[PDB]
Structure 1
Amino acid sequence: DDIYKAAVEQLTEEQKNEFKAAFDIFVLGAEDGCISTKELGKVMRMLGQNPTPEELQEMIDEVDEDGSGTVDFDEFLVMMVRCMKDDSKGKSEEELSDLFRMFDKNADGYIDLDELKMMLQATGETITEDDIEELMKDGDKNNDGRIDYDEFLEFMKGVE
């Protein structure tokens, strides 16, 4: 996952150009010009193995997560690193619990808007208020200003 991007980080999007050339070797002549990886994977399968389109559906759905219907090259990278994962789940969940304890300095068991706001301020991340509310609702799933350990894990699920 991360090793692919790390070994290609010093390079530009030409990795996707090479992937496009490889697809042209197999599925040259795309019509939509949009996100389409099911067809190329199916053509790869058609070389004699057992037909299975569920893997293709999973790969073609791993790209779109924002819900806007658009699939970026960064979304392609996310799909590539999520179909094969080695150091996922934020490494160790015990360290995640330690970080959540750092978040809950009041030790009340509920992260409020104050805790998340101060933690993001310490990070200093420049994210718009829309993304602020998105992250809040991802954490505060029931949307009542309180975030427990389970909500913290869900908010940081697949986050490392």
Structure 2
Amino acid sequence: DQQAEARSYLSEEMIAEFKAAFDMFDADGGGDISVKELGTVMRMLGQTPTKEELDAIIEEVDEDGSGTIDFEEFLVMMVRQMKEDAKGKSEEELAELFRIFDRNADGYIDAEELAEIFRASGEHVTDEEIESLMKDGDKNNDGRIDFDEFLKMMEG
């Protein structure tokens, strides 16, 4: 089920990129990645994992209990890393967006700060538009916009 889902998330084109990586990691070309093969790749990345630590990573994926990671398990592993990064890059955009707007960085975006950003972006925006904006974001009605409110406004 997890592998089927993983598969559906990737394109032919992505799978083949991953078969290639998989094949490289698969040092003996046997079709599945062992604790030894994974360690070589991790050591390479500069880490010092113990055999138990490698065994653990494999368990994250190991749905047939072989103690090794085969291709179907590899994509699940890759897709999990792909979704985590996308999520992490998405959050970084939001944190920094809020940081650009909050020029006096008191942790809140006010109507003036809001205006300057659109101003700076090169777009028109009327005092009525900003007003509408500030009133739809101000959920606790204190006139300013906090990170909680901003997020709600962003992801909508």
* TM bin (shorter chain): 0.3 to 0.5
Name which structure has the greater RCO, CA cutoff 8 Å, separation 6+: 1
TM-score, structure 1 length as denominator?
Answer: 0.38
